[PDB]
Amino acid sequence: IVGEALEYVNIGLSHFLALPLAQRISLIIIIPFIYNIVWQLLYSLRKDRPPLVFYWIPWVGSAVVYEMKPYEFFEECQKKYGDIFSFVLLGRVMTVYLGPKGHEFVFNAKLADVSAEAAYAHLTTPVFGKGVIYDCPNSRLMEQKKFVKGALTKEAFKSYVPLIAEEVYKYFRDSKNFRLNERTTGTIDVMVTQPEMTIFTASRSLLGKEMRAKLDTDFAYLYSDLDKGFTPINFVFPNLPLEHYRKRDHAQKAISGTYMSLIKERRKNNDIQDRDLIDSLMKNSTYKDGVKMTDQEIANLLIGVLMGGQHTSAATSAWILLHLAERPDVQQELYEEQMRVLDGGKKELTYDLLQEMPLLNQTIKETLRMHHPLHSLFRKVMKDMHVPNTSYVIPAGYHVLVSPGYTHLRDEYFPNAHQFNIHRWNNDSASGEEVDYGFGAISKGVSSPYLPFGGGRHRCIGEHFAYCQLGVLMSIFIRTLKWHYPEGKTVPPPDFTSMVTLPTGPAKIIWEKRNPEQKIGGRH
Ligand code: HEM
Ligand SMILES: OC(Cn1cncn1)(Cn1cncn1)c1ccc(F)cc1F
């Protein structure tokens, strides 16, 4: 009889529940631990699945090494399994496709196969607000990008340049980090100065003088609070009742309120011109089906756009300064180009003249190669995906991870990739077939090993603005200052744990005026 064995199942179950809590706790730990390992071993036998990186701790997965050294994690996995491999990350299964084909697979994936907003809405909506970016369908995002792009034109860039230039000079004059009229040399932390210079220049040009004026008050603290809401932690804990989350939520309310106040006052007073992105979105934010963006949505879009560009650009100008700090030869070469293009300084910097500064633009290009601010980009897989020329199938519910920044640092595609060399872009200082997803014709192929601004439908639309901003900034730094490292100091390693891969601080440089007696004018 085995009927008596079925009885012993029941008995065993009863003797189980009657175990001392010291043991049931252990079993509370050992059972999932064993099950996890047993499951992985079975998983490896499945051949329509990419290799899965082994991990001990359930749910957590490979999260620790990934969060700390993601490029080293990728290279190790790449050696062991090749370009396609999966790993577990704090509850989710991430499928990585390395290299140009990975760029194709993910950046050019069909709209039905993957979703960006499904991956990012929880990180971004709390910070930016509702209705925009990733808190809406893709077709809405496509048109939002179209709206923002319409203020990002050549003619706008020509008007932004003297404005950005003024902000940089005002910063050299008034900021405690410089004070070039009282000081001729000094030390700065680039992770202090660049975020401040970035917000000052982006606000003045994209938002206007009103909004820029507000950064000079206590209101600036709100930006700092909202800023801290942009954190990987939001992927796991997007809302938990602490004061981080309430300073953030308050900031979002307070800042979006401020923009609507300006918007509503501009429209009430017929003061809608072609100054900034606010004027632009006001006279141009009606979707194709006739629905107009609310003033709240418009303000939330401003926040997301300004916030994203803030972190990517500030990290980038910080890296530029850090690389140049140990390369006086490059500073020297850049300075000569400045003297040549601007007639020894007797020419005012214009957007057109920026375009005649290839080495300056190659310096940005090369920094973005070595320091892609977003080391990984994700999509959630919505429908089962077959990986071409493999037997692999990526199930829905998986996430795909693309990482052009990793390919940027491979010798195969960039000879001596870990060496900073702006001349590798000689005759190629620009930041076939095209396609238009709703915000303008962009490249159809996304197979370039160099993709600092991504590609496909989620491609960046701030690239020309970023080059404009960074260009003006670096042009003025180069003409005004020399700089170098404190003894023994060199380029810091990246901090991969933050929202962008900014330098590990404190990252300090020593500056000095090329012209100690040069005075910056204006009232202060
Ligand atoms: C050096 C500076 C920047 C870099 C390297 C950069 C990089 C990127 C990348 C890689 C993406 C694709 C993200 C993805 O595929 O998930 C992206 C998207 C985007 N970026 Fe930028 N960005 C920069 C600056 C800016 C600026 C200044 C703005 C606006 C003024 C901006 C606005 C946007 C927008 C609206 C998207 C679309 C996101 C989507 O469609 O899902 N970015 N950027
Ligand atoms: O793509 C981001 C969001 N993100 C993805 N991984 C990490 N952060 C960043 N970004 C890209 N270019 C500029 N910022 C973004 C996209 C659009 C946006 F409006 C804000 C925003 F943070």
For residue 132, which ligand has an atom nearest its CA? Answer: 2
Tell me, using a 6 A CB cutoff, whether residue 207 lines ligand 1.
no
* Residue 17 in domain: no
Which of 64, 18, 58 lies closest to 38, judged by CA? Answer: 58
> From residue 39, how far is each of 32, 34, 49 by CA, in Å?
10, 9, 14
Helix 328-341 vs helix 295-325: angle between axes, to the nearest 10 degrees? 120
Q: Whose CA is nearest to atom 10 of ligand 2?
A: 308
Peptide bond into 506 cis (omega under 30): yes
With residues binned 3-state (H G I as helix, E B as strand, rest as coil), the percentages for the chain, rounded to 5, are: 50, 10, 35
CA distance 95 to 116: 15
134 among the known binding-site residues? yes
Hey, which of 120, 311, 312 would you mutate to test ligand 1's pocket, going by the most ligand atoms within 8 Å of its Cβ?
312
For residue 234, which ligand has an atom nearest its CA? Answer: 2
Tell me, using a 6 A CB cutoff, whether residue 127 lines ligand 1.
no
Question: What one-character-per-residue DSSP string does 463-495 give?
Answer: HHHHHHHHHHHHHHHHHHEEEEPPTT--PPPB-
Question: What one-character-per-residue DSSP string does 252-283 give?
Answer: HHHHHHHHHHHHHHHHHTT---SSSHHHHHHH
145 among the known binding-site residues? yes
CA distance 281 to 299: 9
120 among the known binding-site residues? yes
Tell me, using a 6 A CB cutoff, whether residue 354 lines ligand 2.
no
Q: How was this structure determined?
A: X-ray
What's the resolution in A? 2.2
* Residue 94 in domain: no
386 among the known binding-site residues? no
Distance of CA 73 to the CA centre of its chain: 20
84 φ/ψ sector (left φ>0, alpha ψ -120 to 50, else beta): beta
**In CATH, what number is assigned to the domain containing residue 202?**
1.10.630.10
Q: Whose CA is nearest to atom 20 of ligand 2?
A: 308
Tell me, using a 6 A CB cutoff, whether residue 309 lines ligand 2.
yes
Residue 213: partners with Cβ closer than 8 Å, 6 or more residues away: none
Query: Which two tokens mark 190?
Result: 């680039």
How many C-beta atoms lie closer than 10 Å to residue 79's C-beta?
Answer: 8
Tell me, using a 6 A CB cutoff, whether residue 465 lines ligand 1.
yes
What spacing in Å lies between the alpha carbon of 462 and ligand 1's midpoint? 6
* Residue 409 in domain: yes
φ, ψ for residue 272, nearest 5 deg? -105, 100
What spacing in Å lies between the alpha carbon of 454 and ligand 1's midpoint? 8
492 forms beta bridges with none
Which of 169, 188, 183 lies closest to 484, judged by CA? Answer: 188
* Residue 16 in domain: no
Q: Are 121 and 134 in contact (CB under 8 A)?
A: yes
CA distance 127 to 112: 27
* Residue 173 in domain: yes
Tell me, using a 6 A CB cutoff, whether residue 472 lines ligand 2.
no
Q: Whose CA is nearest to atom 7 of ligand 1?
A: 453
Tell me, using a 6 A CB cutoff, whether residue 453 lines ligand 1.
yes
Give the count of domains, the chain. 1
Q: Whose CA is nearest to atom 12 of ligand 2?
A: 308
* Domain hosting residue 245, numbered range: 120-513
Hey, which of 111, 157, 453 would you mutate to test ligand 1's pocket, going by the most ligand atoms within 8 Å of its Cβ?
453
Hey, which of 281, 460, 502 would you mutate to test ligand 1's pocket, going by the most ligand atoms within 8 Å of its Cβ?
460
346 among the known binding-site residues? no
410 among the known binding-site residues? no
* Residue 139 in domain: yes
What spacing in Å lies between the alpha carbon of 152 and ligand 1's midpoint? 13
Q: Are 467 and 431 in contact (CB under 8 A)?
A: yes
401 forms beta bridges with 96, 378
CA-derived radius of gyration, the chain: 26
Helix 117-128 vs helix 295-325: angle between axes, to the nearest 10 degrees? 100
Hey, which of 67, 122, 124, 148 would you mutate to test ligand 2's pocket, going by the most ligand atoms within 8 Å of its Cβ?
124
* Residue 266 in domain: yes
Question: What one-character-per-residue DSSP string does 266-327 give?
Answer: HHHTT---SSSHHHHHHHS-B-TTSPBPPHHHHHHHHHHHHHHHHHHHHHHHHHHHHHHHT-
* Residue 376 in domain: yes
User: Residue for token digits 């030869």?
Assistant: 329
Which of 274, 324, 298 lies closest to 470, judged by CA? Answer: 324
Tell me, using a 6 A CB cutoff, whether residue 304 lines ligand 2.
yes
CA distance 460 to 452: 9
Q: Measured at the alpha carbon of residue 402, what is the angle toward residues 505 and 492, in degrees to the nearest 5?
A: 15
Element (DSSP H or E) covering residue 339: helix 328-341
What spacing in Å lies between the alpha carbon of 499 and ligand 2's midpoint? 9
Q: Whose CA is nearest to atom 11 of ligand 2?
A: 308
